[PDB]
Structures are given as structure tokens and as C-alpha cells.
């Protein structure tokens, strides 16, 4: 075995084709399935795995009540091969109410965060054993990507934040080698708030697109250098913006350096990636709620801040059906690196008061150079019938 280096070119994407679906909430009405939120996907050299943050309970269970809170002592990181639902035989890999994972070509790294809100701990677990730990530096909810990390030549990188959601916050990038922390860099450039990054290898470096809870409805960008640990940052130029809430496409605007100050506060985790001067991205179909999901290409949208020319639209979930977090992952092929994405399908409280629980399904899509048609792939559970 050898470390990953991602040094192949990016594949010629024409759009996205279906790859996987879990059916978790429909199976839960007659079966023992875990309650979860904040899922993600990541792959070793042979196959892909699905991850999620459990709530320490199955769904048809007295402990499923009030499962809406994000931080408790009972949350753990669940891990399965992609397409096996989270049944009672699932492995718990670490204690965590926030996490990230990646495979360096020889073994898994997991980054796991737990403890008191104002004095939290992060554990680094590599090849099945604890190797390092660090403590909250700003004493106000230490947090990380809820999605895969990226590793080149044995060095992994992860983005971590501490401090306020509606003001200035402290963000650092940690460089890690076989679980040992080797270097740390503070965030630099013009990005002013940085949460829940989605990251992809872009050899020789790494590139991340993130959430701005403070002032942007345009998304921040962070570029990371693996050879000298340097950092730079900016915003996605496209006039069609990716955050939720946002202004309608008739009236939205963006800036390559600054938060647009349009419906800026709050947000949702998402993704975008460069394709020359064009950008591919996904977003909720509705502008003020997490309903539907669509993807498209914007012409010159990576470099021209006034562009609104979209093409190759696809609906993934139609406007009547709930969505949630979404994120990128990368897969190495015979001659190029492909890009794929996943969407969280949230059900139950607080919006759907027919039940006492909150949980999710998922659906997954991968980039194709061939051709494709149309459809919609929602969650598909009937909350009027199944256990309260």
C-alpha cells in the first residue's frame, strides 16, 4: 500500500447520474434502525462508506422523543458500507457531536468532538487507536466539517472553528500525519465567517467551499497549501448564490471578495466546484426554507461576479419535498478524478408535528461524461401512518 496523492486531472462532467439511496425512514416503520442527523460519504481505495451522528437510540423506542437537540453526551459516529442501512449491528467508531473522517491510502483518520459547550475536547483516532487531542481555544462550541477531510502524501487537513455564529469567530486549519498534529494555521484573506466546509483535492493543494452564518448569502472559499501550510480566502463570484435563505434570482447579487449583505444571517451546508471559469453547484429550490434540491452550471460563474447565465439544470428532489445538508466527495477513476455529492432528507420535528422524533434518509449522485434523463427521488415515508 501507498499514500493517496490525487495527481490525476478532473473528469469532463456533463451532469450527474443516480448512484445510491438508503430508505431508512420507510424501513424504520417495521425494523430496528438508528436515529441520525448530519450524514456524509467517504471512500477507501476499494469501496465507499456512509457516516452519521447517532442520537444514542433506535426510532421505535421511548428514547426517540426530543431528538431535536444537536449536542448531548450520547452522540456517537456511526460507520457502514454505502447502501447498508444503520441497523443494530452497525459499528460506533468514537464519541462525537461533531466529526470528520478520511482515508490516507493506508488507514482511516477520524476527528471526533465532545464535552461541555464551553470546555470541549477534540480526539484524533488513527488506525483504530487514539493518537492526539486538543482543547477548545475560544470556549464557545468547538466544531468541524460534518463531511470528509482530504489527505495528500500522508498529510491530512481539517478546518475547525470556535466562537460566535452571529459575529467574528476563530478559525484554524490543522495539518495531521498518522493522527499526530504537526502544524496549525489561522484563517487569512477576506472570508469573514467560515463554518461546515465541503473540501476537495485540487493537486497540489486543497480547496473548500463553506457556510457564512453572519453576513453572506454568497459562499466563502478557502484555498490550502500542503507544502508550506499557507492559507488564502475569498467568496464565490456567481450572481446566482448558493446559501439559504437568499434573495430571488431576479434581485440577488455577489462579490468576489466580500459578503453580499443580502439575507446574510443563518445558512445551510452546501458545495460548489470550479470547471475552468464555469462553476457547478447545488442548492435548495425554495429561497427561504429547506425544500427541494437542484443543481446547474453557471457560465463564467467562478470569475465574473455579474453572470446569471445557467445551463444543464437537474432536479434531484422536487419543490414539495424536504431536503437538508449536502456535500461533495471525490472518487479516483482509471484516468481522472470524479466529483459526487450527497443530500440529507430530514423528516419529523419541528416542522412535521405528526411524530415526536427527528431523523433523516439520504440520496447520492455522481458526475458523468455520458447522458442522462429526469426524475425526483424524495424520502418517501408516510408520517401519518408510522410510529409517533
Amino acid at each position, epitope marked *: 500500500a501507498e499514500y493517496r496523492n490525487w495527481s490525476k486531472p478532473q473528469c469532463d462532467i456533463t451532469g450527474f447520474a443516480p448512484f445510491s439511496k438508503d430508505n431508512s425512514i420507510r424501513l424504520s416503520a417495521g425494523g430496528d434502525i438508528w436515529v441520525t442527523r448530519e450524514p456524509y460519504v467517504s471512500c477507501d481505495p476499494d469501496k465507499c462508506y456512509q457516516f452519521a451522528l447517532g442520537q444514542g437510540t433506535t426510532l421505535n423506542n421511548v428514547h426517540s422523543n426530543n431528538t*431535536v*437537540r*444537536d*449536542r448531548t453526551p450520547y452522540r456517537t459516529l456511526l460507520m457502514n458500507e454505502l447502501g447498508v442501512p444503520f441497523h443494530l449491528g452497525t459499528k460506533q467508531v468514537c464519541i462525537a457531536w*461533531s466529526s470528520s473522517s478520511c482515508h490516507d491510502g493506508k488507514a482511516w483518520l477520524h476527528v471526533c468532538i465532545t464535552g461541555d*459547550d*464551553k470546555n470541549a475536547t477534540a480526539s484524533f483516532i488513527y488506525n483504530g487507536r487514539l493518537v492526539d487531542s486538543v482543547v477548545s481555544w475560544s*470556549k*464557545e*462550541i468547538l*466544531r468541524t466539517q460534518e463531511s470528509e477531510c482530504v489527505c495528500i502524501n500522508g498529510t491530512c487537513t481539517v478546518v475547525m472553528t470556535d466562537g*460566535s*455564529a*452571529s*459575529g*467574528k469567530a476563530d478559525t484554524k486549519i490543522l495539518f495531521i500525519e498518522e493522527g499526530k498534529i504537526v502544524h496549525t494555521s489561522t484563517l487569512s484573506g477576506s472570508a469573514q465567517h467560515v463554518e461546515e466546509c465541503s473540501c476537495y483535492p485540487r493537486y497540489p493543494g486543497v480547496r473548500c467551499v463553506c457556510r457564512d452564518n453572519w453576513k453572506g448569502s454568497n459562499r466563502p472559499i478557502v484555498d490550502i497549501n500542503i507544502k508550506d501550510h499557507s492559507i488564502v480566502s475569498s467568496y464565490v463570484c456567481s450572481g446566482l448564490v448558493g446559501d439559504t435563505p437568499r434573495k430571488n434570482d431576479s434581485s440577488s447579487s455577489s462579490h468576489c471578495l466580500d459578503p453580499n449583505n443580502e*439575507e446574510g*444571517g*443563518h445558512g445551510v451546508k452546501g458545495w460548489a466546484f470550479d470547471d475552468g471559469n464555469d462553476v457547478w453547484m447545488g442548492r435548495t429550490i425554495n429561497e*427561504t426554507s429547506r425544500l427541494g434540491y437542484e443543481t446547474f452550471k453557471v457560465i463564467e460563474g467562478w470569475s465574473n461576479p455579474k453572470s446569471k447565465l445557467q445551463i444543464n439544470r437537474q432536479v434531484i428532489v422536487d419543490r414539495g419535498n424536504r431536503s437538508g445538508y449536502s456535500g461533495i466527495f471525490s472518487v479516483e477513476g482509471k484516468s481522472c478524478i470524479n466529483r459526487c455529492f450527497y443530500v440529507e432528507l430530514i423528516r419529523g420535528r*419541528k416542522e412535521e408535528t405528526e411524530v415526536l422524533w427527528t431523523s433523516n434518509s439520504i440520496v447520492v449522485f455522481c458526475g458523468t461524461s455520458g447522458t442522462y434523463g429526469t426524475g425526483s427521488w424524495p424520502d418517501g415515508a408516510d408520517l401519518n401512518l408510522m410510529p409517533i
Partner: antibody
Amino acid sequence: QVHLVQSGAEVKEPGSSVTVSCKASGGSFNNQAISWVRQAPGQGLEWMGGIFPISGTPTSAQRFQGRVTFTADESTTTVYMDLSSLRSDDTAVYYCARAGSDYFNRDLGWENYYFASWGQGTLVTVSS
Amino acid sequence: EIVMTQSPATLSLSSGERATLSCRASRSVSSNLAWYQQKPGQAPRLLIYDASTRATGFSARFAGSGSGTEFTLTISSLQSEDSAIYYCQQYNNWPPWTFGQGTKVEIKR
């Protein structure tokens, strides 16, 4: 009873800072947020910020974000609010109040952030 | 960010009659709406919350109404102590927690 009790009135020179404080009569700082709201003469109500007394996450309104800080102590059972770089315009009654809200969710934000109970109000004026 | 518009600005009516006050939000606040009464020279007091339910200090003569982007308060059989200023406030999920500019009631004796 639970009720909030505030510190006395003040005159401060421009460019100075002021400390105001708020204490629970019942000793009963549960995690429901303590919030600061001000009222300038003949003018509407204005939220400035707040803190959860146990879990300790502070928050501040955008207009005040560089100028104000909040801190808390269970032992004195008191929340302290410091307002810096004072100007004549800061002349107002400052109230502490107790919110219906007692948890912050990373993703979903706050819930029940309305003011159930209020202190006496403290008059602060800025003058030479 | 979310703007609260309250009307009328001033209202005046005789005792023993009904009075009505209104509030509007620049985006839908989905029932996350409260009303306060402030009597002259005192701290404000919570009157209604979730647009729909009244606090312990107030009786069946006070009623809340409306949803989404428009809201209403009604006082039945007006009395001497009702002479006060009233404010709406929203609390929809994220800061800041904006108040309306308020409505004054004075009694036409």
C-alpha cells in the same frame, strides 16, 4: 421570588465605559438567557445582547458588536454588562430581562426568545 | 433585517368599547410573535406570546389573532388603566429580535 434586581443610575464622561449589573432575588439562575434592552427618551425598544447563565454563550446586536461585552457569575448569581466608548446618544434606560430561551442549536439557532420578566431599569447618561 | 410595522400610530376611544391594534412583518414570522404593554414610568410587561396565548397578568378581554406576515391584538370594553403604549416583537429563529415602533392608547373620557 425569582425577580431581577439592577444596579443604580450613573453619569459618565464621553469616551468612558460603564458597567451595569443584574441579580436574581431567588438565587435561581437556570440556563434561561438574561438579555439587555434599552429605551432612549421618547423612543422605541432596542435589543443589545444577552448570555445563558450556565452554558455561557454570549450574543450581541450588530450596532453594538465592537463596543459591548457580557459576563456572568453563579456565585454572586449576577450578570454584568460593560458598554465602552460612550457618547451623548447612549443616554437611555437600560433594562435586564429574562428570555423564554435556554439552548442554542448550531444549525437551527434559537427558540422562544421573548422577554417574560424585567428588571427595574437603570438610567445611564453621558455628559461632561 | 426583518422589519416590524405597527398601526395605527395613536388610537383614542371612550371606556366601555372595543379597541384593535395591528402589526406586519417584512417576511413571514410563522406565529413567532409577542405583544408588550408599557404603562407610563415603568418597565414593559409581556401581554401575549406565540400570537395566540395571554400572560398571567391579563384576562379574557385581551385577544391575539393572525399568522404568517399580519397579526392583530384586540381589547374588549376599554378601562382607565388601559391608557398605555403597546409594542409587537418577532422572534423567528435568528438575531436580531426586532420590535415594532409601538402604538399609544389614550382614553376619550
